[PDB]
Design a protein around this nucleic acid. Structure first.
Ligand SMILES: [Zn+2]
Ligand SMILES: [Zn+2]
Lengths: 139, 927, 73, 117
RNA sequence: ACGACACAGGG
RNA sequence: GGGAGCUCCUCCUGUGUCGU
């Protein structure tokens, strides 16, 4: 009679608590990896030519070393791992990054040795170590 | 003109001065000087048209003008001879201007003149009025006074917010540049009183008869007596002058060696805490003829009005003494030959020195309640800690309890991407829309806790007008008469949330349940009886708050000890429960807004006002800038319910405990102890009720200032004119309490100024005609009162006014009002900001709140709050509610789809949340 | 939808990811990130908000904790 | 109810008898025996008897004006600087607190000093 | 109508 | 107490579950 309905309600309320516990544990565990996927999902959805260039550079290797500054007189340095990542990113002394024009000051090598902007050419490229940290200010 | 030239030559006369005729050979009719008059026809502190003086101005060499005038009164002949006789007696006093009585043929026959010399342009009454009735757009006299006496320059007024106390706090220095002038005026007043007494003169000393140099004149209402038996009446003078004594820091020269501002500061002894004879000396030096008893230690006061009076004087005098002499007073106590260091007293800035009564040395063991009161005491915590010099704040820092400083940060909120995707799928969050996300979880860095604690720099020592305060308090007491309070036993306390913290240092060993279970009922009763004879100082712990908001400012919350709450419950809970259970009163606390509570509240405020307008204001930095005198007043009107269960000593020691624990306790911010100057405590139970008391107090003060500052000769109503006359008479004459007029003024307020008060949030329905005529308070009156009694500037862009009552209040408790048709009747429903509901839905403070299917009740409550938006004329506002219902439906559908999948099968009463009948019935009266 | 709300939600998620990567262990860096986040949440124009988003994303990318090639693909 | 009571009693009295041994010394006994009635304010117990000072300095100008050198003066005493750290609880050397090296370190700096004899 | 738990809104 | 990352505040109101 009523006792069977009471036992049924008890089973239901005992199952809808173990379900909540399982889902809560699952969300607690899967965090720090679903949040990064969500972040990049909603970053590719913005479609900004400033964020997209940074993301492409970073997935190829041209990563910054400090916070990118939004002031005209501040200073920025990045890491150029390859030659092709330099041949298309920079021309002469004008640096193109984060949809802004930057002007190179000094280019240090992997041994903290200043390598000149005239020596960085396609022919005499492969005789370096090529983590060429370059420095620049936005124009 | 030969007449004017001869009159000028006679006005100069003997004292060689170069005079220029400011005005003409007739009266000048000065533009609206402030007067303090009380006669059979008018009474009040207002601005009148003085028109019986022929002023002149004196110029030194180089022919440039000075701030020294020759005022020449032209009254009658009997008053001429009377003033001449009265001046011939006080002539030798140095605080008396020259007068040079003479007769000059003006209209053909020897009009008599009285020519006082080298006074000033303005008067102490003008300074007090300018600083009390402060209008930021009509402050010409204040500017001229500040420039004339070299406190600042016109370039200082060229800047913006120059008058503000929160923005530009340099106005405090600019004001304090007048302190020595005000203090020399006080000294001249005491000299004049002494001369009047020694000459046998009886008369009232009013502010409008004294220069800004201090000299006195206008001996028109003075009577002779036997020499040595004179008596000056100085109630209104000192009472009106008091609020600007602490604003201008008049007693700063008392902190120096020879009471002059050039010698070094007094090197007070560091072990000294009494300062009673110093306070008596200050009183006898500056208020010699204030003829009411002053008790430096308020433990000897006769009632709570005496406590208010003497605490006002103490809050004035405590600014002279070193800030390291206040706080608990520790003593060496032996516990089985082992020495302790425990507080055996307290030195308050307002209540003076108070000593505990149950202090026992040489104990063989410590009981449980003795262990509690010794562990809650900051004496042993600060005595065994490291010295601390915190250069990040200007507040006093006692000691660092740890070897490292704690830098506590706040996290960003969690993004509920499913709800946001659903919303933008329904057409929300578009470009240039009506609803936009404006409420987020703002993050804070490590420097947030101490930078928020530093906002206590807005709490300044405020000396109040006591003759006004101890009448406003009677009116507030009339406002709090329908309630029932007193003390309750330990088995009558209704404690909810018994699994929370117990403050510092009790949170190291358990929750509140631990201490409510370890203490018996008689143990709690013994602790409560202990707090009625001894002062227990406690520590409160400040930590950040993790909540959604619209401003990027950090919000801190306080957690007070378990002793403080355990005893304040037994003290105040009966009255608090009674306040929160009364429907239809002024203080609407505990009145729900559902089932027609909003409509009932609004219909109660609208009660019977004749030409009703609505009004509402705010208090800038209310918790930080609330002066200590008003907090003591609130505590006193709350404890006024204990007239049968406690004696005078019990009530005073409960007031001292309240102060030491909630008003000026030791704050533990991080791992360090600081001294809190004043304000309200967040984790106190009675703070929302003390705020209501303070709100009603400020409103009544604005009303009495609005009524007393109008020209009584322009009030057409005889009843209101006589009410203003009797209001002045009951403030500044009539030292006793006139219950009849208190009832009459309370009825006047309730009839023409109807209030709805919560914690520092108010809505007023006032008579618009009386307000436009100046008979009840306006917004400018609240601005003035807050400026001179709260040390804040209330911007008129934060206050609103509603001239149509079918439109409800603009905002009350962050809720808007809307007249809705609900079954043949038009009711007032409260609706929130749609951005608040959407932000509560989109950003959560815990990660599992993003699953959705686990938190359907969370959306049901949000839809309950967002229902009234469905009646709004804007369409996006109703779309909010429909969105919430559709999301609840989708959540239940996918919960079912998951329960049927991961388990075998499942089956009930959820369809009642997909339809608006539930939330609609949530807003109608029961039956 | 819009572009301001999108970048505000994305800044919230950026600061969450950066807090998970233990940036609060650097007072200077966490202060800069908090300032950029709170300035994005209060901005009205969608031109400087993208600049602060550039700065915050640069903060995230200048580390070597979060892999950026598997996330991009 | 009867077992939690004894536990919290032991805990409270252990805390008291612990922070008591860090307190009793000649400084406290010497400043209390100079008071006329054995009663002194609490705000002067650490100011006069504490043997360690912690200074929290937000800027470099405040550091230059307050704790410049290896010994400074505060509350009518000489303090000897040791173990100055930054907001990250990392040891900072005295040679690194410069005007040009100021933006390279985390503020505030927490200076620890011992009272000099 | 009375307590426990969870949630939601308003210093 | 359960839960979360040595710590988790107060007052009021309202829902939803449970038990009298
Ligand atoms: Zn008294
Ligand atoms: Zn009582």
């Amino acid at each position: 009679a009523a006792m069977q309905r009471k036992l049924e309600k008890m089973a239901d309320q005992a199952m809808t608590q173990m379900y909540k516990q399982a889902r809560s544990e699952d969300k607690r565990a899967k965090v720090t990896s679903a949040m990064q996927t969500m972040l990049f999902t909603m970053l590719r959805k913005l479609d900004n030519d400033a964020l997209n260039n940074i993301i492409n550079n970073a997935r190829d290797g041209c990563v910054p070393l400090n916070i990118i500054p939004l002031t005209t007189a501040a200073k920025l340095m990045v890491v150029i791992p390859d030659y092709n990542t330099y041949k298309n990113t920079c021309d002469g002394t004008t640096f193109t990054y984060a949809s802004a024009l930057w002007e190179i000051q000094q280019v240090v090598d992997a041994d903290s040795k200043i390598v000149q902007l005239s020596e960085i050419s396609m022919d005499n490229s492969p005789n370096l170590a090529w983590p060429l940290i370059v420095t620049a200010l936005r124009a | 003109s030969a007449d004017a030239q001869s009159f000028l030559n006679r006005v100069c006369g003997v004292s060689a001065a170069r005079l220029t005729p400011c005005g003409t050979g007739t009266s000048t009719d000065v533009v609206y000087r402030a007067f303090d008059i009380y006669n059979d026809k008018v009474a009040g502190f207002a601005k009148f048209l003085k028109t019986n003086c022929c002023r002149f101005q004196e110029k030194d060499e180089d022919d440039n003008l000075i701030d020294s005038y020759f005022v020449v009164k032209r009254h009658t002949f009997s008053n001429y001879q009377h003033e001449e006789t009265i001046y011939n007696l006080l002539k030798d006093c140095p605080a008396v201007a020259k007068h040079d009585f003479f007769k000059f043929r003006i209209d053909g026959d020897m009009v008599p003149h009285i020519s006082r010399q080298r006074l000033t342009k303005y008067t102490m009454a003008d300074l007090v009025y300018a600083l009390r009735h402060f209008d930021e757009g009509n402050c010409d006299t204040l500017k001229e006074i500040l420039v004339t006496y070299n406190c600042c320059d016109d370039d200082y007024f060229n800047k913006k917010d120059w008058y503000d106390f929160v923005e530009n706090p340099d106005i405090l220095r600019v004001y304090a540049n007048l302190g020595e002038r005000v203090r020399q005026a006080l000294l001249k007043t005491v000299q004049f009183c002494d001369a009047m007494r020694n000459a046998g003169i009886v008369g009232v000393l009013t502010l409008d008869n004294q220069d800004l140099n201090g000299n006195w004149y206008d001996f028109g209402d003075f009577i002779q007596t036997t020499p040595g038996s004179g008596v000056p009446v100085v109630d209104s003078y000192y009472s009106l002058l008091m609020p600007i004594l602490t604003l201008t820091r008049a007693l700063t020269a008392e902190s120096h060696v020879d009471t002059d501002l050039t010698k070094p500061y007094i090197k007070w002894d560091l072990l000294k805490y009494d300062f009673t004879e110093e306070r008596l000396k200050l009183f006898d030096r500056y208020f010699k003829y204030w003829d009411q008893t002053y008790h430096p230690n308020c433990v000897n006061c006769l009632d709570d009005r005496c406590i208010l009076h003497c605490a006002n004087f103490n809050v004035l005098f405590s600014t002279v003494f070193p800030p390291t002499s206040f706080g608990p007073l520790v003593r060496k106590i032996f516990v089985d030959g082992v020495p302790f260091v425990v507080s055996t007293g307290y030195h308050f800035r307002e209540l003076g020195v108070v000593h505990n009564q149950d202090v026992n040395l040489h104990s063989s063991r410590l009981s449980f309640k003795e262990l509690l009161v010794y562990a809650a005491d900051p004496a042993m915590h600060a005595a065994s800690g490291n010295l601390l010099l915190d250069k990040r704040t200007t507040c006093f820092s006692v000691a660092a309890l740890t070897n490292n400083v704690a830098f506590q940060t706040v996290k960003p909120g969690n993004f509920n991407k499913d709800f946001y995707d659903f919303a933008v799928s329904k057409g929300f969050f578009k470009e240039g829309s009506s609803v936009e996300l404006k409420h987020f979880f703002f993050a804070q860095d490590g420097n947030a806790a101490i930078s928020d604690y530093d906002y206590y720099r807005y709490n300044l020592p405020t000396m109040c007008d006591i003759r006004q305060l101890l009448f406003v308090v009677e009116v507030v007491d009339k406002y709090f008469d329908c309630y029932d309070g007193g003390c309750i036993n330990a088995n009558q306390v209704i404690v909810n949330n018994l699994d929370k913290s117990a403050g510092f240092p009790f949170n190291k060993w358990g929750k509140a349940r631990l201490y409510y279970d370890s203490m018996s009922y008689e143990d709690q009763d013994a602790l409560f009886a202990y707090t009625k004879r001894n002062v227990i100082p406690t520590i409160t712990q400040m930590n950040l708050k993790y909540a959604i908001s619209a401003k990027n400012r950090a919000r801190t919350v306080a957690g007070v000890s378990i002793c403080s709450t355990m005893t304040n419950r037994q003290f105040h809970q009966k009255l608090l429960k009674s306040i929160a259970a009364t429907r239809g009163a002024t203080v609407v606390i505990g009145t729900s807004k559902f089932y027609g509570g909003w409509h009932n509240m609004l219909k109660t405020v609208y009660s019977d006002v004749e030409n009703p307008h609505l009004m509402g204001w705010d208090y800038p930095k209310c918790d930080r800038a609330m002066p200590n005198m008003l907090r003591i007043m609130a505590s006193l009107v709350l404890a006024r319910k204990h007239t049968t269960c406690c004696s005078l000593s019990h009530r005073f020691y409960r007031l001292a405990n309240e102060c030491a624990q909630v008003l000026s306790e030791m704050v533990m911010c991080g791992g360090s102890l600081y001294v809190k100057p004043g304000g309200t405590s967040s984790g106190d139970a009675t703070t929302a009720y003390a705020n209501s008391v303070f709100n009603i107090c400020q409103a009544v003060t604005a009303n009495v200032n609005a009524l007393l500052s109008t020209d009584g000769n322009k009030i057409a109503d005889k009843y209101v004119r006589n009410l203003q006359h009797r209001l002045y008479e009951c403030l500044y004459r009539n030292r006793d309490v006139d219950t009849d007029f208190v009832n009459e003024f309370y009825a006047y307020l309730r009839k023409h100024f109807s209030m709805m008060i919560l914690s520092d949030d108010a809505v007023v329905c006032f008579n618009s005609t009386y307000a436009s005529q100046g008979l009840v308070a306006s917004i400018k009156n609240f601005k003035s009162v807050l400026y001179y009694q709260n040390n804040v500037f209330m911007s008129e862009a934060k206050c609103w006014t509603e001239t149509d009552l079918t439109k409800g209040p603009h905002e009350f408790c962050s809720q808007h009002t809307m007249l809705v048709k609900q079954g043949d009747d038009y009711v007032y429903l409260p609706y929130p900001d749609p951005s608040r509901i959407l932000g509560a839905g989109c950003f959560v403070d815990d990660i599992v709140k993003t699953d959705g299917t686990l938190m359907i009740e969370r959306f049901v409550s949000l839809a309950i709050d967002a229902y009234p938006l469905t009646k709004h004329p804007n369409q996006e506002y109703a779309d909010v509610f429909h969105l919430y219902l559709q999301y609840i439906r989708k959540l239940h559908d996918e919960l079912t789809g998951h329960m049927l999948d991961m388990y075998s099968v499942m089956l009930d009463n959820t369809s009642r949340y997909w339809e608006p009948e539930f939330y609609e019935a949530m807003y109608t009266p029961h039956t | 939808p819009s572009k301001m709300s999108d970048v505000k939600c994305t800044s919230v998620v950026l600061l969450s990811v950066l807090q998970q990567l233990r940036v609060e262990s650097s007072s200077k860096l966490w202060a800069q990130c908090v300032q950029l986040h709170n300035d994005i949440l209060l901005a009205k124009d969608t031109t400087e908000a993208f600049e602060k988003m550039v700065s915050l994303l640069s903060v995230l990318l200048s580390m070597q904790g979060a892999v950026d090639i598997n996330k991009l693909c």
